[PDB]
Design a protein around this nucleic acid. Structure first.
Ligand SMILES: [Mg+2]
Length: 316
DNA sequence: AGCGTCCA
DNA sequence: GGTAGACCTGGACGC
DNA sequence: GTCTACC
């Protein structure tokens, strides 16, 4: 289909949001394992699905430039202010990252050193359903493979949106699409491994046992502790996946995911060891202590600080 | 050379 | 609870 | 990273 746009080539189709590079680096956020659905289809231009539509995003020094492909057989035009609000909300631009970076660096000199090189790593505010099933796919897995699993899952079960060049975009599947008793076998053919059952069983649990889609809004409005505990009822969701969802979709900035990276970071970069367990290796008790350690260190937005160090550790 | 272990 | 080990997949890469 | 089984 039509080409992926670049800002310099189609300026009439773009609009900007005030956004200095100190507040956001697309290249350090979009491919770093928060969302798995963005691709750099042209140099410095990132395309993906945002609020049921395909967008391309690119940055200049002080502005985030956006273009939207509506795909309702309407004439091409720049994004409207209402449409740009969805982009603003997705990047949570109301939160000033420079002041968080100064706070985290002031309490943690290691953070300060890493942060000098990794500016503008902020937290996306993701759709709860997309975030839930993407991080169910993420456990005991690598970001390259996760990215393919999420792509194939959307191609098979999500609505077709539009085609740009040779790339066909799909929306994220609904709960209902993932809940059928045939879905697990299909997801296994798509290479999801043992997480195929987790995806289908979790879609069924939400629909059949938790009151449907409104449950995620309930958890958004609940405390961190309540939301984190509730998510763990889902097959494939343990304390880490629940923290990922809390932090990245349920507005819990203190949630600190603890994966292989953060465990290695704690040991290597902080010389940390658990003090509430004589055995020091990863365990339910020591993983929970490590999350508390990072909250005690970094404060109420510790999960956002985690995202800076996680993004940096992917490139080392 | 490419199997087979390591690892995310 | 605490502990141990199995587990789908496929790129990295030692031997 | 989460699940299951055993202590
Ligand atoms: Mg669970």
């Amino acid at each position: 289909g039509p080409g992926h746009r670049t800002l310099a080539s189609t300026p009439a189709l773009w609009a900007s949001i005030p956004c200095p590079r100190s507040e956001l680096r697309l290249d350090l956020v979009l491919p770093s394992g928060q969302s798995f659905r963005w691709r750099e289809q042209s140099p410095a231009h990132w395309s993906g699905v945002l609020a049921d539509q395909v967008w391309t995003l690119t940055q200049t020094e002080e502005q985030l430039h956006c273009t939207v492909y509506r795909g309702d057989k309407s004439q091409a035009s720049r994004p409207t202010p209402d449409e740009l609000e969805a982009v603003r909300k997705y990047f949570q631009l109301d939160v000033t990252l420079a002041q968080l970076y100064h706070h985290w660096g002031s309490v943690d000199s290691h953070f300060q050193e890493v942060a000098q090189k990794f500016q503008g790593v902020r937290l996306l505010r993701q759709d709860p359903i997309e975030c839930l099933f993407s991080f169910i796919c993420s456990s005991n897995n690598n970001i390259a493979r996760i990215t393919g699993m999420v792509e194939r899952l959307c191609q098979a079960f999500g609505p077709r949106l539009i085609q740009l060049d040779d790339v066909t975009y799909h929306g994220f599947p609904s709960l209902q699409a993932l809940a059928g008793p045939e879905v697990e076998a299909h997801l296994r053919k798509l290479g999801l491994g043992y997480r195929a059952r987790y995806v289908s069983a979790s879609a069924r649990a939400i629909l059949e046992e938790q009151g449907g889609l409104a449950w995620l809004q309930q958890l958004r409005e609940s405390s961190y502790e309540e939301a984190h505990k509730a998510l763990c009822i889902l097959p494939g969701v343990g304390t880490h996946v629940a923290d990922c969802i809390c932090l990245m979709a349920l507005d819990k900035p203190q949630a600190v995911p603890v994966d292989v990276h953060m465990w290695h970071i704690a040991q290597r970069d902080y010389s940390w060891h658990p003090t509430t367990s004589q055995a020091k290796g990863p365990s339910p008790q020591t993983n929970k202590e490590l999350g508390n350690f990072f909250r005690s260190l970094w404060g109420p937005y510790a999960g956002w600080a985690q995202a800076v160090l996680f993004s940096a550790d992917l490139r080392q």
